[PDB]
Amino acid sequence: MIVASILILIVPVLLSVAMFTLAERTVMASMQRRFGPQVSGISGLLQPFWDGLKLGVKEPVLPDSSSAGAFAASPMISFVLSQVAWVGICISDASFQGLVIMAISSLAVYGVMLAGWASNSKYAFLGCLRSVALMVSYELSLGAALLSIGLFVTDGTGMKCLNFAEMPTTPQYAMLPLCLIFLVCILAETKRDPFDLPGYNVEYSSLGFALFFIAEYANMAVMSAIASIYFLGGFSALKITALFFAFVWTRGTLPRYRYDQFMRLGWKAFLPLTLAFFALHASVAI
Amino acid sequence: YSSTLMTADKLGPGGRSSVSGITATVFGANGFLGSYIVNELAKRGSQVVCPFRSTENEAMHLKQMGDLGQIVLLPELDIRNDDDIKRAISRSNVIINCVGMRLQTKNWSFEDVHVDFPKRLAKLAAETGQVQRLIHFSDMGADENHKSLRMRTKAVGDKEVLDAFPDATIVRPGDIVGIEDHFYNYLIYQLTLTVFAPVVESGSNKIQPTYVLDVADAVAALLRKPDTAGKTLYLGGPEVLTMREVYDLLLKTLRIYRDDTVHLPAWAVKAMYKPFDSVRRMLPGLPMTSPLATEDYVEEMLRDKVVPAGALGYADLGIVPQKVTDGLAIEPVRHARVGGYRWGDMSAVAKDIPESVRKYYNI
Amino acid sequence: GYAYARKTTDKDYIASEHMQAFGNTQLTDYIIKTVPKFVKMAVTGPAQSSVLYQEPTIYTTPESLVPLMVFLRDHTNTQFKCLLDVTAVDFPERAARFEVVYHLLSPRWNNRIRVKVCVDEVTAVPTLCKVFNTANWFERETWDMFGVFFSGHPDLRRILTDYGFTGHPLRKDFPMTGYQEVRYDYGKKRVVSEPLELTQEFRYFDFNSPWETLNR
Amino acid sequence: FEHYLPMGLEYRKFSPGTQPVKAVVPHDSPK
Amino acid sequence: GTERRPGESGAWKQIERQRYASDWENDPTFKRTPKNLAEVLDDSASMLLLTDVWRGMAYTLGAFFDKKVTIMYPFEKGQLSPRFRGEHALRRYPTGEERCIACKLCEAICPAQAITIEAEEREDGSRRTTRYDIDMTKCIYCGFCQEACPVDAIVEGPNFEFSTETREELLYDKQKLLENGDKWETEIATNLRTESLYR
Amino acid sequence: AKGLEFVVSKVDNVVNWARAGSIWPMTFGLACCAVEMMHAGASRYDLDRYGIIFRPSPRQSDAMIVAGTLTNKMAPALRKVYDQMPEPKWVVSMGSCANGGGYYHYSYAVVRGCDRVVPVDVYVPGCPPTAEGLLYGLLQLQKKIYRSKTTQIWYKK
Amino acid sequence: TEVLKRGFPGMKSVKDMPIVQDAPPPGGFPTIRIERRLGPTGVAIFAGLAAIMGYGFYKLHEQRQEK
Amino acid sequence: AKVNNFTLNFGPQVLRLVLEMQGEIIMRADPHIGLLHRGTEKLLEYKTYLQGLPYFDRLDYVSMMCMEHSYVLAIEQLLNVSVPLRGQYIRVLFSEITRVLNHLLAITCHSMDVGALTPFLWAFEEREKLFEFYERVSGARMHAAYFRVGGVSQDLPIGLLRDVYDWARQFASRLDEMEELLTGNRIWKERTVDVGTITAQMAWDWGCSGPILRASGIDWDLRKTQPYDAYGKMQFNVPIAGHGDCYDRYLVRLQEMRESLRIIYQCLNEMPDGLYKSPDGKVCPPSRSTMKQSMEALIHHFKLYTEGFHVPAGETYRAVEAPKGEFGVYLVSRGGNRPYRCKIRSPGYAHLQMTDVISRGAMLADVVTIIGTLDVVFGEIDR
Numbered sequence A: 001m002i003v004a005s006i007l008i009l010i011v012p013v014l015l016s017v018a019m020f021t022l023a024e025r026t027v028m029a030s031m032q033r034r035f036g037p038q039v040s041g042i043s044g045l046l047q048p049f050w051d052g053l054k055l056g057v058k059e060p061v062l063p064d065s066s067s068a069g070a071f072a073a074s075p076m077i078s079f080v081l082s083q084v085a086w087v088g089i090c091i092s093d094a095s096f097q098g099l100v101i102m103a104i105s106s107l108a109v110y111g112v113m114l115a116g117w118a119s120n121s122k123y124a125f126l127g128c129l130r131s132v133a134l135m136v137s138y139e140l141s142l143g144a145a146l147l148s149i150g151l152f153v154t155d156g157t158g159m160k161c162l163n164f165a166e167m168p169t170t171p172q173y174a175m176l177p178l179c180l181i182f183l184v185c186i187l188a189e190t191k192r193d194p195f196d197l198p199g200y201n202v203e204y205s206s207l208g209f210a211l212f213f214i215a216e217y218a219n220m221a222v223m224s225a226i227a228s229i230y231f232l233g234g235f236s237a238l239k240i241t242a243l244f245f246a247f248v249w250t251r252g253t254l255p256r257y258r259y260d261q262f263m264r265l266g267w268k269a270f271l272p273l274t275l276a277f278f279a280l281h282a283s284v285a286i
Numbered sequence B: 001y002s003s004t005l006m007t008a009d010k011l012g013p014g015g016r017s018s019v020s021g022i023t024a025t026v027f028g029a030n031g032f033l034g035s036y037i038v039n040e041l042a043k044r045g046s047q048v049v050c051p052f053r054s055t056e057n058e059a060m061h062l063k064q065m066g067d068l069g070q071i072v073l074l075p076e077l078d079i080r081n082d083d084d085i086k087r088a089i090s091r092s093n094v095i096i097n098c099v100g101m102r103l104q105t106k107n108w109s110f111e112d113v114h115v116d117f118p119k120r121l122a123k124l125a126a127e128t129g130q131v132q133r134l135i136h137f138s139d140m141g142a143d144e145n146h147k148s149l150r151m152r153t154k155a156v157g158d159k160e161v162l163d164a165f166p167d168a169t170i171v172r173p174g175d176i177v178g179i180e181d182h183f184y185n186y187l188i189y190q191l192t193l194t195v196f197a198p199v200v201e202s203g204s205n206k207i208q209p210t211y212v213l214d215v216a217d218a219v220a221a222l223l224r225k226p227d228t229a230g231k232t233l234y235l236g237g238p239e240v241l242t243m244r245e246v247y248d249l250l251l252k253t254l255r256i257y258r259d260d261t262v263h264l265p266a267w268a269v270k271a272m273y274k275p276f277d278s279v280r281r282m283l284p285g286l287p288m289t290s291p292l293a294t295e296d297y298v299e300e301m302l303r304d305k306v307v308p309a310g311a312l313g314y315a316d317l318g319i320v321p322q323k324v325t326d327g328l329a330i331e332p333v334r335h336a337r338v339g340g341y342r343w344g345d346m347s348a349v350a351k352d353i354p355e356s357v358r359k360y361y362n363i
Numbered sequence C: 001g002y003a004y005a006r007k008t009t010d011k012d013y014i015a016s017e018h019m020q021a022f023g024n025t026q027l028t029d030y031i032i033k034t035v036p037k038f039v040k041m042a043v044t045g046p047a048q049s050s051v052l053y054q055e056p057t058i059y060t061t062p063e064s065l066v067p068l069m070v071f072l073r074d075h076t077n078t079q080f081k082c083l084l085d086v087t088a089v090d091f092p093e094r095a096a097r098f099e100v101v102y103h104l105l106s107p108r109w110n111n112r113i114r115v116k117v118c119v120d121e122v123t124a125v126p127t128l129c130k131v132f133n134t135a136n137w138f139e140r141e142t143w144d145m146f147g148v149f150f151s152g153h154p155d156l157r158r159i160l161t162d163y164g165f166t167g168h169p170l171r172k173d174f175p176m177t178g179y180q181e182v183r184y185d186y187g188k189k190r191v192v193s194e195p196l197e198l199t200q201e202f203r204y205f206d207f208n209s210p211w212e213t214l215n216r
Numbered sequence D: 001f002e003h004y005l006p007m008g009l010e011y012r013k014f015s016p017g018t019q020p021v022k023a024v025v026p027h028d029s030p031k
Numbered sequence E: 001g002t003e004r005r006p007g008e009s010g011a012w013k014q015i016e017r018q019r020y021a022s023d024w025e026n027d028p029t030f031k032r033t034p035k036n037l038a039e040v041l042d043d044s045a046s047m048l049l050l051t052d053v054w055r056g057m058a059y060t061l062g063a064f065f066d067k068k069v070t071i072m073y074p075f076e077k078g079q080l081s082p083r084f085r086g087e088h089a090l091r092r093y094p095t096g097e098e099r100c101i102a103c104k105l106c107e108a109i110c111p112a113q114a115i116t117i118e119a120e121e122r123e124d125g126s127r128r129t130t131r132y133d134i135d136m137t138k139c140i141y142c143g144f145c146q147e148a149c150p151v152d153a154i155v156e157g158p159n160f161e162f163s164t165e166t167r168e169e170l171l172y173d174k175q176k177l178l179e180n181g182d183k184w185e186t187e188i189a190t191n192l193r194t195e196s197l198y199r
Numbered sequence F: 001a002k003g004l005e006f007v008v009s010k011v012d013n014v015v016n017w018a019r020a021g022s023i024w025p026m027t028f029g030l031a032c033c034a035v036e037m038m039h040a041g042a043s044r045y046d047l048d049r050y051g052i053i054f055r056p057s058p059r060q061s062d063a064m065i066v067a068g069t070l071t072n073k074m075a076p077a078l079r080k081v082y083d084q085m086p087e088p089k090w091v092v093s094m095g096s097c098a099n100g101g102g103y104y105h106y107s108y109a110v111v112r113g114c115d116r117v118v119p120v121d122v123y124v125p126g127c128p129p130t131a132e133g134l135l136y137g138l139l140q141l142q143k144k145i146y147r148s149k150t151t152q153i154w155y156k157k
Numbered sequence G: 001t002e003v004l005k006r007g008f009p010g011m012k013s014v015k016d017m018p019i020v021q022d023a024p025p026p027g028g029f030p031t032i033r034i035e036r037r038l039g040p041t042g043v044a045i046f047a048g049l050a051a052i053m054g055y056g057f058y059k060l061h062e063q064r065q066e067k
Numbered sequence H: 001a002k003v004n005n006f007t008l009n010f011g012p013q014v015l016r017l018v019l020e021m022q023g024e025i026i027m028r029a030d031p032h033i034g035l036l037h038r039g040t041e042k043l044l045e046y047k048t049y050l051q052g053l054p055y056f057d058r059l060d061y062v063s064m065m066c067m068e069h070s071y072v073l074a075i076e077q078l079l080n081v082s083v084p085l086r087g088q089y090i091r092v093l094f095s096e097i098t099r100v101l102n103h104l105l106a107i108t109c110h111s112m113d114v115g116a117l118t119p120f121l122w123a124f125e126e127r128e129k130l131f132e133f134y135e136r137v138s139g140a141r142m143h144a145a146y147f148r149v150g151g152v153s154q155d156l157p158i159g160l161l162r163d164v165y166d167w168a169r170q171f172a173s174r175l176d177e178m179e180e181l182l183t184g185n186r187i188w189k190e191r192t193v194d195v196g197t198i199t200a201q202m203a204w205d206w207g208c209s210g211p212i213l214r215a216s217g218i219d220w221d222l223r224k225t226q227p228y229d230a231y232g233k234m235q236f237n238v239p240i241a242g243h244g245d246c247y248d249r250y251l252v253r254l255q256e257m258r259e260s261l262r263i264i265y266q267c268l269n270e271m272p273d274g275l276y277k278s279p280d281g282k283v284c285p286p287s288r289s290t291m292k293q294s295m296e297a298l299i300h301h302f303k304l305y306t307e308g309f310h311v312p313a314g315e316t317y318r319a320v321e322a323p324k325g326e327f328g329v330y331l332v333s334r335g336g337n338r339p340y341r342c343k344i345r346s347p348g349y350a351h352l353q354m355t356d357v358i359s360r361g362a363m364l365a366d367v368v369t370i371i372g373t374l375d376v377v378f379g380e381i382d383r
Ligand SMILES: NC(=O)C1=CN([C@@H]2O[C@H](COP(=O)(O)OP(=O)(O)OC[C@H]3O[C@@H](n4cnc5c(N)ncnc54)[C@H](OP(=O)(O)O)[C@@H]3O)[C@@H](O)[C@H]2O)C=CC1
Pocket: B027, B028, B029, B030, B031, B032, B033, B034, B052, B053, B054, B077, B079, B098, B099, B100, B101, B108, B113, B137, B138, B139, B140, B172, B173, B174, B175, B176, B177, B182, B183
């Protein structure tokens, strides 16, 4: 029954990832006064499936100067971690569920760094360290935000936890600036605009590349569900769609930062703000 | 006919825009050897007609090889149909056969490819009257008394070709090395990517490998010399090697420090390869199947494959063949070594190199 | 560094009367009288700045090109601060077949001038890199195209042509299509240079009338 | 705020091959 | 707005300069220091809580709900004019005789040398071409040949959709150019009935 | 036999529908013709509507669009980037310069056609071709992809 | 020759030849905008934010006591 | 310590750059060019003066008619040819349409290199409208070959000024909605403010021109100091900034689009009736009706389309305020129907030479901003 529940979870995750990448193309097109994919299937509804099948019959490039095992292992590790994080969202009852998902998302750094070590490109090694530095820098603000969230999460028996079923079903109006910081931290983790300067998958083709992008979009959906649980009073389909629309909307209208600019932002703005909010919420919670 | 083939219509000094006067049909032009032959003919200003069975994507690389109008591409070739063969040779004074096979399939057997098609090709070539030369390719180990089926069907087809077209040249090269070959590539796929590499007996059978560019030059040298019509030539490199020596050279070149080969008796190798040979028919042909995983390869490994004494070889064509073990021929296998090819520390010789060069290379 | 924005109103005028009269009429005689050893020949002709005026052309030796250019940059009446280009023209009938040409612009008084040096293939021209910073790439291009060596340049190397390119293409005796051409070889697996062959050779049309009077 | 994309007949009402008035182009001066 | 701030400076020399000296207060393009409480709250609501990102977001959301400028090719087309320079073509008189008389003016004016012409006299004494080639891969589509022709024989027609799969299909000889003219004759005549008022 | 051949033909139909509807080209914006290729990707013509995504790396690229003149200095770099694309791949030559040298055909510095360096599937004529003409050429390349039958050829080997 | 092109029957002088070209309408075209044309007070924004956050903190206190 | 420079190769895929870094800070930049050098200066010696005119469209192929202008003016000065009034007005009007096209592409490609994708897609539809204006008068969307010696090639078709006025009536709104995404945005400011600063002395010492020169506080516009055609009649302002910034160049370029709109509106109301070509029949070809009815016109048509006019012996340098700066042609005439030497001066060649002194002290993510703000096209750089 656990294997059945996990496969029944896995099916809409992949279907949703295909529909997310189509919806990103089409919403980005509608903001730019065009159409986006319409030809490939009726209303363009077959475009992600033909992208996946095109990459399926695409030639796998295995460079004969790299280490083949780590090269194969990097997108597998990314994909596996995304699927495991989704299972932790929906098929768990653990006491420290948010800490579990934070631990899983801290493991997601390895696919980037294994891709940087494996492929023998000069600037893949240069960009992997930058991407890892960005993700590493914003993980701390995510953790301090979780500290602020957990100060008010108590179940019926009186025990404090990070269990998702014990979270309240009303929006957390008291933590609006922390919610905004959380959303920009999600944007920084997924390497989206305005942090998309670093790429690391420059040597990958066919289904290894497809695994990289499925992992990226599934991680975006994980973080969207986490933000909707923590701040928006629950996990729902409408909230997932609205937050995804917001992320595409921000990608349509903004330019990106330099490397040192978002490093200064994450180490001089977001971390002191989350720590100061934690101290204020701890003072309130007494 | 004699040397009017190479002289009578030759216009221009011999580059891409010149005219050599040769109209040639190459069967199996998208293959390993055929692509090099088509490049050799077309770069001197010859019209080359290329029929093919495969998809156009696998034949697109032949389109580049000649000037406008000189590479002719005919898709959907069916060699059981005489109309396609008749259309493909209808303007050619040279026919070159590179069609061959290594494994049997439920649609194609060794006799269909090595016997029936060369016989019908030689007959249709002799019917036209304008074909002055027919170059047929066979193997160095071809023999009617061979236990391997492909060598026997090749020798039988050689006999049929020399019967139906009496001035056809039979060419019998050894193992051909190249970037896209079937000799070092499968041996490297056997040294790596497998738990163990079987070697038939002691590996003391002798071979004479040769380079693909030398065979491509040999075809043009045959087309120059009128005496070579009706003859049989054996093409082999300047070194005679055993299979154990070839394996040792590949293991030294690849920089592998663990000999994963094991020497096995021939019955054990045949017992290994027997389950995937009784099921080779009723199957359309599978990808990534080695041509060394057959009993015919085991029978070939129990014999020498060298140039016979007194035979016509490279020297009668004026060609000094290149070495196969070292030089440009061994450079592709040097790219598959552990870690990468790479230069080195590059600091002993950068001592008296000028100023901007060391900083450019960050030495 | 001149022509700073000073008037906040719309200006309906170009220059002043006295300085424009001096630049358009007296500048040739002025340059000849003040620095006579620098000038060997002068032409006053159809005016780079506008169709309505006249402007000078100064001929000088290579031994005094740098002091003349420093004088033309820094003198209070001739403030030629901008060097627009350096180029060459080939005259194969002359003993010294090259004319190196320098154009200058004066933002202070809305003027322009042209400076010429005549050399052959083996006489070096002093560089103007220290006087004008744009002289670097233009001298590199002139060396690339004509083979004029500029002595004292920091790094005189070719800038426009191919990597192994020997030969100077803008000479009159260099062919339009050149000597070599480029193709991909399937056997060598490399892009290879070969001697030139053309499918259709270039057709030269000789249109020139035997009654025409203007040919010089 | 002026809108991009004008509607029907508000821009390029006549195609250049269906000019509504014949054109008389001077090619020489009367002098 | 185009105003500057100490801190929003993109470089390091100016960042070091603004935090160690007050030379930026002399420059009129800088935003001045807030002087009272309400100005401090306005500056903080500018820096924190964004509100400059939000104006661009409101504009792009307005564009999301606006009209689109995409045409559905090949069911819908763009807009061109009778002067448009497309595929070259050779023309006839209404009787069916060729207009071309082998004057070789279009071959002389062609800056690409894309035209090759040979001629002799026809069996009825007429002056006509025996070869008229246009290398369409050498052509630059300038229209100078159309200007040089004194009998309106060579034109650039209104066709732009003529991509092929082999390059030998783009070396036009005389017969194909006459076939193009026989295809496009009515459209070419309609275009030339307007463009003869100007040329 | 009839059923399995019918299934194999439908596998070719689906694979060709996928490959033609997911062409990811690589941009060589060498010259003039690149601006018309930018106009093809813009909101009026919308190359993204047909499933076309421009990719920066050759490893994810399905096609090459040579849009501009090719010089002797640029030819080995173009060849090297072409060799790094994985199979199956196509080449679209755009404009007179890439087609046959064009206006620079008799120059000492220009390759007379990108045919001389790489093989080409579809030639688009013009100097420049319009963006709509480039759409016509890309739809023709899609038609060439539709006529391919890869698993039917493999089934009869 | 120009009289053959633009002249009309009964034209007395060469100065009477018509001219019909692309021209602006009588009076010209109307004028257009050339230059650039262009929020709430930070006190108001901070007041609304403080009101929302104060309501949130009151709800947090109430749910804490209920728990 | 004794820190050696780390070097980097930046793009075969047509600018090649060899950088040196001391960490995250660049110490040197060396552009390697010639990947688009097609030898057009040699090929122009083998063409007649009309034959070599479409070479100039393919130098700065974002701004075509402005490249044609300087070559035509250089020929006209040596020929002593006067242009009629309507042709001068048409040349000014289409030169300003060309400047608007170039500035739209330059600003939006710069903002796309920085990371903002929407302004590109917004501005290219306006670019499509101005391409339709090119096509309606020349039949080509880009390489028009419209400007000729002594005037323009054809007259304006009836109905063009009506549509140019209808576009100009809404272009200010388009530029306004363009600036709402970029001008008051902190990310764009933090990318552009104080990046790659150029002072006036460095601008004149490095041969700068165009909107670079105006952003460093220099009042120098060739349309106001050395005017050509009817630019002296035009009433417009020169925008001036004083930091030498990327941000200041962006603001100057937007204001220059406003001023080009002002000149376009003035040309739409003062367009005169009359000749658009010079009446010298020994330079300008006759009309097609005149050629088919008079013997002298047919002789002049035959000779002007084969041998061409003979330019008298001499030399000139003529320059135009092209939208990237000063574009100039040095024409050397021996007396024939072919140019003896035709040197082409491009502003982007001089602007790209400055990347060694402009990128010093910057980071890797600011190189693309510097390259984008110099406004370079390699057709005119690599002739
Ligand atoms: N070292 C070597 O490789 C040696 C080769 N030879 C012989 O020389 C020739 C070289 O072949 P090689 O290129 O080396 O290996 P290939 O397998 O690459 O040659 C195969 C060619 O034959 C074609 N072909 C095979 N079967 C058929 C068929 N039934 N109908 C139509 N075409 C067919 C293939 O087309 P498709 O691609 O569609 O299958 C391909 O073009 C062969 O005859 C080989 O036996 C001799 C000595 C050694």
